[PDB]
Amino acid sequence: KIVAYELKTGGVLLHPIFNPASHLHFSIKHPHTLSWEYYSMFQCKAHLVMRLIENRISMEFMLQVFNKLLSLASTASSQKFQSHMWSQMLVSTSGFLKSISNVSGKDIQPLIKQWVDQSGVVKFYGSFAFNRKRNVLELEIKQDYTSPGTQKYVGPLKVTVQELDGSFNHTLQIEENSLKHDIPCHSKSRRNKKKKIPLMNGEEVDMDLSAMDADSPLLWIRIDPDMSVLRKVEFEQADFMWQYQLRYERDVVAQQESILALEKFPTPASRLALTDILEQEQCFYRVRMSACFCLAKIANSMVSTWTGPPAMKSLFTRMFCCKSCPNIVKTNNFMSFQSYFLQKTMPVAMALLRDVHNLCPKEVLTFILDLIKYNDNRKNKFSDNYYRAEMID
Amino acid sequence: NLQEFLGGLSPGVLDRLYGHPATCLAVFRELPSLAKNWVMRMLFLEQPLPQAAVALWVKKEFSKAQEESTGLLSGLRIWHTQLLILNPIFRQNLRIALLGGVPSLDKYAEERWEVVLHFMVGSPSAAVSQDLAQLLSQAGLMKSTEPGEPPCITSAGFQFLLLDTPAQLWYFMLQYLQTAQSRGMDLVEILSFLFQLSFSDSLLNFLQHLREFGLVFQRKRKSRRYYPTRLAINQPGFIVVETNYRLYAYTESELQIALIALFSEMLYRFPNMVVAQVTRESVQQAIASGITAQQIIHFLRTRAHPVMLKQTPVLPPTITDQIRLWELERDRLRFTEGVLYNQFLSQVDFELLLAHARELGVLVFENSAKRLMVVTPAGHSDVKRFWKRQKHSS
């Protein structure tokens, strides 16, 4: 939301100094002259910058800062002196930074100078190349700092590389003149023997390594995984790396960004990846709800190649319909709250299917109308208004 | 072949080359089977005839002979459609050609060719002739690079050496004509003499070169009259091959012993016989020099003693197979120049880039499973631009 708004119009400036922001058509000196979208993005950027301050100075020290502010205010709140002490209930920026420096011993003045006083987000364009001879991974990260909303980042940058030997984090120092970052790569001895490949968490899984390159061990790369800067990343992986990142990652933002990047690769391996995500309980439900729409877009792009039925129809009849009647939907029992959301989002994406003539097929429209006719809600303890409203959608 | 040589010519040189005395007859004899008769037929016609008649003038069976003869004679341009009357000049010359208008010599030719081959090989004693040496050097079978030192023998030289006398001489004369054009000697005038043999300053020099090759011999202190030898118009074997890679050759002329030593190890030399061994060392030495097993096998077969002619095949299968295997073991590893890009991302987008390097001729090997393509550095400035254009298209 904030990178869309700041690249759209100028930027949000937390803590201006009194104009400080002349790129935008109102004055930021008073709350009653702000646009309402600017007020909303102001609150949004403020809580993300506080998450960044928690990233630099750990969460227990952050809660100690907040407790110190509240304790000064509550010793202030019981005095009777007319504001000799009632102004300890008012916080400022300098007092907040001083309380942070009191509890932690680190000051955050570079982070405050970059993300508060400066009003911009950063844009990262990354591309990699694997050097087989020296066994290194040559990343190439360049910033677009000449757009109207952007600024230049010179700090450190975390990158997480999943190779066959596991998941390794690397810190890169991205100075102004930097372009190529050579990080080292590990072995490929988990392709010699079939062993399980260890993940970002402690677990390990069986991966189908037939799509991987023979010479490179690395399975996927993520630039800034923890969202530790206010950034927009445009990484150029290969399509099998996006499919491996969609399947076997233990991070929902990486699964979402792989869904978002698989729309450019309409190959049938990506259709298999999104269909395996859709069938998979123990995936987070908002990833499957995105995979519905991604599968609809991919299915629209590979018409005159699609083999069987329309997308997600057989999967809908496998998950939510009767075993004896495929075209009759099961009676509504909405007590699971994840297959309820997936059931009410799957025909909405299924209706975006189009034939070679650019008209929605009469197999999906008939399916949606049979979902509407055979709807029986006399048996669940929950209402049907959102599911029926999504059927109209 | 002479058919190839004459086919590789223009109409302007062809009609001039069709001289009255002999050419119209020498080129006629070339006509393999049927073109003789049709040409004879329409030797007396002053009126062209339709092509359909010629087409239907051969039965359905064996028509391929008709088409091949018609194509060959169309290439020779003996006639013109004129709409198939023969060329008037050729018709007149052919009508004028049809009722209109030694034991010491062969030995001399043999000895002269033998001494020529002795000079070709590294023989300390051989006939000396600067013109012959430079002619052989420019024929493509010899390179000197140093006038003071005697010229060595190139790879093609050994292959030419191992050829039989007829083909050897024919190829030598073909190269002679090709170099005659380069040096400026008129090709037509010299060529007509060869045809006339089988029945000016340039002529005198050409005849001198032919005499040096041994095809002709004036015998009268270089008089106008000449008596061509047998080779000018255009024998039992002596090697016995064992099953243990042993050759017993009844050779008295040093040329045969040298030729055998080129690909065999000599052991004994008797007055009327010589013993050699065909070992890996000698065979691979010849192969490295440039020979291939086919020439060695053909040479041994043609110079096969009558004793081993009774057995079929004449050359033992073990010897032949061993020679072939020895030649095959010679080459394994390779060499090329290339550059590799990677990360081709989209599957359907990488297939379009494969056709760009294949049409230009800079593609070595590809890979649709890993999206990898090797491009030679010679065309690197053209593939990258295409890739950039594709990226721009998106």
Side-chain angles (χ1 to χ4, degrees):
Chain A
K1 216 184 287 169
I2 305 163
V3 300
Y5 187 75
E6 290 215 34
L7 297 183
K8 166 198 158 190
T9 167
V12 175
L13 177 51
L14 319 174
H15 193 239
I17 287 303
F18 325 108
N19 49 2
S22 62
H23 44 86
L24 82 184
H25 59 95
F26 46 89
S27 85
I28 58 163
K29 293 167 58 190
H30 208 267
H32 293 318
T33 61
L34 294 190
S35 173
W36 193 254
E37 201 178 2
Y38 187 85
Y39 192 45
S40 303
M41 292 316 147
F42 190 89
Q43 311 170 216
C44 195
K45 198 181 169 171
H47 88 266
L48 291 192
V49 169
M50 282 282 180
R51 193 191 160 261
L52 264 49
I53 303 177
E54 182 258 355
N55 277 15
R56 189 179 267 217
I57 292 183
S58 54
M59 192 203 284
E60 47 96 19
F61 282 164
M62 185 63 106
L63 297 173
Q64 281 170 18
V65 173
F66 299 159
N67 171 62
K68 282 188 160 213
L69 293 186
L70 281 160
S71 180
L72 277 174
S74 75
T75 61
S77 159
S78 50
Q79 312 311 318
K80 138 194 291 176
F81 331 126
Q82 304 78 343
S83 92
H84 289 45
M85 205 160 305
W86 284 351
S87 77
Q88 290 168 22
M89 272 177 304
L90 300 172
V91 77
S92 64
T93 308
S94 70
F96 180 63
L97 302 189
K98 203 193 308 302
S99 170
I100 281 180
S101 177
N102 283 169
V103 83
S104 69
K106 300 178 283 291
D107 72 328
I108 44 167
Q109 197 44 66
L111 194 140
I112 295 294
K113 195 208 167 212
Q114 184 156 25
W115 297 117
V116 179
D117 277 318
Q118 263 198 34
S119 157
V121 298
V122 305
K123 281 181 104 172
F124 283 128
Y125 296 92
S127 83
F128 74 104
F130 177 73
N131 198 299
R132 191 197 171 272
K133 168 184 172 303
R134 323 199 288 116
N135 208 29
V136 308
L137 171 58
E138 326 181 340
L139 281 151
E140 200 261 3
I141 308 172
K142 40 184 188 310
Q143 310 174 53
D144 167 44
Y145 61 96
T146 72
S147 293
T150 42
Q151 78 178 5
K152 153 171 275 37
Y153 188 64
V154 288
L157 184 88
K158 178 154 163 268
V159 58
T160 290
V161 185
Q162 174 87 32
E163 312 171 23
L164 291 159
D165 279 45
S167 187
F168 313 101
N169 318 108
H170 298 85
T171 286
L172 267 43
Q173 206 79 30
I174 55 199
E175 308 193 305
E176 326 83 22
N177 52 51
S178 76
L179 196 75
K180 278 278 178 192
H181 309 280
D182 296 322
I183 73 178
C185 275
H186 290 258
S187 175
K188 44 174 71 63
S189 67
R190 307 228 182 196
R191 201 191 297 126
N192 287 113
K193 286 105 74 175
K194 235 58 183 171
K195 287 205 141 185
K196 338 247 303 170
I197 294 143
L199 289 177
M200 190 181 74
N201 56 338
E203 314 294 296
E204 48 180 359
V205 286
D206 286 23
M207 302 198 192
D208 192 358
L209 307 176
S210 48
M212 203 172 41
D213 274 29
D215 48 296
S216 69
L218 56 97
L219 283 135
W220 66 84
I221 314 161
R222 304 166 60 203
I223 287 184
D224 196 43
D226 293 326
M227 293 169 290
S228 46
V229 286
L230 262 48
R231 87 290 191 278
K232 178 176 187 307
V233 213
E234 285 106 353
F235 202 55
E236 301 269 320
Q237 268 168 52
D239 46 1
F240 72 92
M241 304 190 171
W242 289 118
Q243 290 144 25
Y244 284 137
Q245 191 180 154
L246 185 43
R247 290 192 220 216
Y248 306 104
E249 184 83 75
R250 302 290 92 201
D251 195 4
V252 285
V253 291
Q255 295 189 322
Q256 266 149 35
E257 78 194 10
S258 56
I259 275 168
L260 201 40
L262 271 191
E263 300 169 357
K264 323 172 291 184
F265 314 105
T267 59
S270 58
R271 167 186 173 190
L272 182 59
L274 298 151
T275 315
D276 290 333
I277 284 297
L278 258 179
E279 250 178 332
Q280 198 194 320
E281 296 92 5
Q282 95 193 17
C283 181
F284 180 49
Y285 75 98
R286 300 186 164 279
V287 178
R288 307 158 78 194
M289 297 201 317
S290 299
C292 291
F293 290 85
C294 184
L295 188 49
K297 289 169 193 164
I298 279 178
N300 292 1
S301 73
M302 55 194 266
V303 291
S304 74
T305 303
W306 198 275
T307 54
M312 303 153 277
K313 176 167 149 49
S314 176
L315 183 52
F316 202 99
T317 57
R318 179 187 320 148
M319 266 202 278
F320 306 110
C321 300
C322 302
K323 279 90 167 181
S324 60
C325 301
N327 53 12
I328 315 295
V329 67
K330 281 195 183 299
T331 75
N332 289 349
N333 191 20
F334 294 152
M335 67 179 289
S336 161
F337 294 163
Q338 322 196 19
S339 31
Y340 158 67
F341 276 126
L342 189 54
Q343 182 189 181
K344 93 190 208 195
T345 196
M346 211 180 295
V348 185
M350 217 188 306
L352 291 151
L353 266 297
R354 297 296 185 255
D355 270 337
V356 198
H357 325 290
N358 293 115
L359 289 138
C360 173
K362 178 76 170 218
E363 233 180 313
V364 220
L365 168 65
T366 306
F367 177 73
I368 287 156
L369 292 172
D370 296 349
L371 270 160
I372 289 177
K373 172 151 59 169
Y374 294 107
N375 180 41
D376 209 57
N377 203 81
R378 302 173 301 161
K379 280 131 84 173
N380 47 358
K381 330 170 301 183
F382 302 111
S383 294
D384 211 1
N385 49 302
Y386 290 106
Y387 176 61
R388 290 199 306 251
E390 293 294 336
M391 286 328 285
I392 305 301
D393 293 348
Chain B
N1 198 321
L2 178 61
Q3 58 172 49
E4 188 201 351
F5 186 65
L6 291 190
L9 291 176
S10 72
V13 69
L14 274 165
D15 55 15
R16 270 99 55 90
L17 172 57
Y18 291 175
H20 56 289
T23 300
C24 61
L25 173 63
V27 182
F28 176 80
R29 300 280 180 69
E30 172 183 349
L31 307 175
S33 284
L34 298 174
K36 298 199 291 294
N37 298 6
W38 297 311
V39 149
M40 235 109 59
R41 300 174 64 190
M42 65 192 66
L43 183 55
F44 289 77
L45 277 286
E46 294 291 340
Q47 199 271 329
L49 57 85
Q51 291 71 246
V54 167
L56 62 85
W57 272 342
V58 165
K59 285 195 184 297
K60 64 210 85 165
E61 198 69 30
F62 314 115
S63 296
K64 314 313 302 194
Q66 173 64 282
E67 292 83 4
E68 56 86 17
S69 71
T70 314
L72 174 59
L73 278 79
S74 82
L76 298 170
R77 296 168 146 287
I78 292 163
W79 62 78
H80 317 306
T81 182
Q82 203 181 8
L83 195 76
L84 294 160
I85 200 171
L86 313 187
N87 300 14
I89 183 61
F90 183 79
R91 166 182 275 90
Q92 193 197 355
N93 281 12
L94 176 51
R95 201 191 311 284
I96 296 303
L98 192 151
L99 179 39
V102 169
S104 170
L105 283 71
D106 55 65
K107 299 306 307 311
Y108 154 84
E110 200 177 9
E111 208 288 329
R112 185 64 60 85
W113 202 231
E114 274 197 51
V115 295
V116 166
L117 295 163
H118 287 116
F119 158 75
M120 178 60 203
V121 301
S123 187
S125 181
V128 302
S129 184
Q130 65 93 29
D131 56 358
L132 185 66
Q134 59 86 34
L135 175 61
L136 288 158
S137 175
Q138 74 193 345
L141 54 78
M142 267 176 81
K143 81 189 183 296
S144 86
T145 71
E146 40 182 359
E149 199 72 28
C152 58
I153 296 90
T154 66
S155 296
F158 294 106
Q159 305 191 17
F160 160 92
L161 275 161
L162 295 192
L163 296 196
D164 302 334
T165 316
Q168 190 177 220
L169 192 83
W170 155 245
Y171 161 82
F172 182 57
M173 290 173 69
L174 182 139
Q175 286 299 101
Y176 178 96
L177 297 169
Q178 268 188 12
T179 48
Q181 187 59 45
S182 296
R183 71 182 92 166
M185 289 291 106
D186 49 354
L187 190 145
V188 179
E189 184 60 28
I190 67 184
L191 181 59
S192 198
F193 187 93
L194 309 174
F195 295 161
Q196 191 269 326
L197 276 182
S198 180
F199 298 114
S200 68
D201 190 299
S202 176
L203 281 165
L204 288 156
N205 200 6
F206 170 83
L207 188 68
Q208 195 265 317
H209 280 177
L210 270 293
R211 181 255 297 166
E212 209 161 9
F213 305 155
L215 312 195
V216 295
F217 182 35
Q218 285 86 343
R219 197 164 267 181
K220 201 158 83 72
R221 301 282 81 74
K222 301 290 94 175
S223 66
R224 196 260 293 165
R225 173 60 184 164
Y226 50 84
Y227 288 107
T229 71
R230 264 291 303 286
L231 279 67
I233 296 90
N234 308 116
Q235 60 90 42
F238 50 83
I239 312 190
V240 172
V241 189
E242 303 299 347
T243 63
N244 56 3
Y245 316 110
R246 198 75 74 79
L247 314 171
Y248 302 79
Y250 305 80
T251 54
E252 295 86 350
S253 63
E254 208 274 333
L255 173 62
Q256 301 298 346
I257 297 89
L259 293 182
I260 285 162
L262 282 170
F263 67 98
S264 79
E265 295 194 350
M266 283 178 56
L267 302 190
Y268 308 90
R269 185 162 174 194
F270 305 127
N272 64 357
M273 199 262 277
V274 67
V275 186
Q277 201 188 3
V278 184
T279 61
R280 288 178 62 262
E281 310 173 7
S282 87
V283 161
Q284 273 208 333
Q285 194 188 8
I287 295 286
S289 78
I291 299 144
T292 174
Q294 177 42 244
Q295 287 106 26
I296 290 161
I297 291 157
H298 187 60
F299 172 89
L300 298 168
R301 174 57 184 81
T302 183
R303 289 157 176 82
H305 202 263
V307 65
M308 61 190 299
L309 291 180
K310 284 83 171 171
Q311 56 178 84
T312 183
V314 175
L315 265 290
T318 304
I319 311 306
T320 59
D321 301 7
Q322 194 64 69
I323 296 162
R324 293 211 179 77
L325 211 59
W326 285 348
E327 78 157 1
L328 288 164
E329 202 249 2
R330 188 82 285 181
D331 293 339
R332 179 192 64 261
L333 262 249
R334 284 188 36 179
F335 261 123
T336 225
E337 58 164 21
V339 88
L340 179 95
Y341 334 105
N342 182 9
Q343 338 287 13
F344 280 106
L345 266 78
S346 151
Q347 179 180 359
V348 297
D349 186 74
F350 183 75
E351 294 293 328
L352 184 62
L353 188 63
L354 295 173
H356 182 74
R358 186 179 296 113
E359 184 178 1
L360 270 299
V362 298
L363 193 144
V364 212
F365 209 73
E366 52 186 1
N367 192 0
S368 296
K370 294 181 177 67
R371 293 178 179 83
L372 293 174
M373 180 178 70
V374 176
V375 176
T376 61
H380 181 73
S381 65
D382 188 74
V383 178
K384 44 154 85 177
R385 189 204 176 240
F386 181 76
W387 178 81
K388 263 324 260 205
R389 191 151 92 250
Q390 162 183 276
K391 183 178 179 180
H392 299 291
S393 64
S394 64

